[PDB]
Design a protein around this motif. Structure first.
Motif, PDB file in Angstrom:
ATOM      1  N   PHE A  74      38.058  16.323  47.363  1.00  0.00           N
ATOM      2  CA  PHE A  74      37.140  17.611  47.025  1.00  0.00           C
ATOM      3  C   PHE A  74      37.737  18.654  46.207  1.00  0.00           C
ATOM      4  O   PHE A  74      37.094  19.059  45.361  1.00  0.00           O
ATOM      5  N   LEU A  77      38.466  17.528  42.470  1.00  0.00           N
ATOM      6  CA  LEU A  77      36.989  17.315  41.937  1.00  0.00           C
ATOM      7  C   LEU A  77      36.526  18.623  41.494  1.00  0.00           C
ATOM      8  O   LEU A  77      36.044  18.785  40.345  1.00  0.00           O
ATOM      9  N   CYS A  78      36.539  19.583  42.330  1.00  0.00           N
ATOM     10  CA  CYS A  78      36.190  20.777  42.018  1.00  0.00           C
ATOM     11  C   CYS A  78      37.252  21.530  40.823  1.00  0.00           C
ATOM     12  O   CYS A  78      36.437  22.122  39.840  1.00  0.00           O
ATOM     13  N   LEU A  88      32.866  26.992  46.944  1.00  0.00           N
ATOM     14  CA  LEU A  88      31.597  26.120  47.348  1.00  0.00           C
ATOM     15  C   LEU A  88      31.772  25.958  48.772  1.00  0.00           C
ATOM     16  O   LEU A  88      30.521  26.039  49.423  1.00  0.00           O
TER      17      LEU A  88
HETATM   18 HG   LIG Z   1      34.145  19.905  44.663  1.00  0.00          HG
END
Ligand SMILES: [Hg+2]
Length: 186
Positions: A74, A77-78, A88
């Motif tokens: 995560f 990817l962010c 997020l």
């Molecule tokens: Hg993300």
């Protein structure tokens, strides 16, 4: 001004641990998807987008091992998409306040013209993504009364109230649900 190649490169440079083939295409797909959105100059981040991304990621990452890497993935990817994963996650979390509220109350808040945040995200314009639909779907599942039993009827109640493109939403959620039902029964 980044490119799909640059984004894939940033993600794989940040996360150099093995990602299983069962999960790897979903991640690649989501990388490309967000990239294409975030470089449209009419795309504007909002908590509705955040809830969508967290929801879609959490759904396709169910069962992922090693579970510890789910958060590393995560994060990577962010950062590849020039987003802050903490932002997020906070934004997603901010929707929890509506758990158990009835649809009547939400419609009253929206019709007042002064809805609380993040519910106000439903009004804000900009480039529409299927991730907005996913976010909306997650929010509706929090409400009292199982409002997604007749999802399209619920979406027709929102149509006069919010400028989110409800016909696009209805079709995106039909595809989302169809895809998930297939994956789940294989
Ligand atoms: Hg993300």
């Amino acid at each position: 001004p980044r490119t799909v190649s640059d984004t894939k490169r940033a993600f794989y440079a940040a996360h150099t641990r093995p990602i299983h083939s069962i999960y790897r295409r979903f991640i690649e797909e989501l990388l490309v998807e967000i990239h294409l959105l975030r470089v449209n100059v009419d795309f504007r981040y909002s908590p509705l987008f955040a809830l969508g991304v967290v929801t879609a990621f959490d759904q396709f990452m169910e069962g992922y091992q090693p579970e510890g890497d789910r958060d590393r993935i995560f994060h990577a990817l962010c950062v590849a998409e020039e987003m802050n994963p903490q932002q997020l996650k906070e934004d997603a979390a901010s929707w929890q306040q509506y758990q158990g509220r009835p649809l009547s109350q939400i419609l009253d808040e929206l019709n007042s013209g002064q809805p609380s945040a993040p519910l106000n995200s439903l009004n804000h314009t900009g480039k529409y993504s299927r991730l907005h639909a996913v976010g909306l779907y997650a929010f509706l599942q929090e409400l009292a009364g199982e409002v997604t039993i007749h999802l399209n009827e619920t979406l027709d109640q929102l149509a006069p109230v919010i400028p989110l493109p409800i016909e696009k939403v209805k079709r995106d959620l039909e595809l989302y649900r169809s895809n998930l039902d297939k994956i789940n029964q294989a």
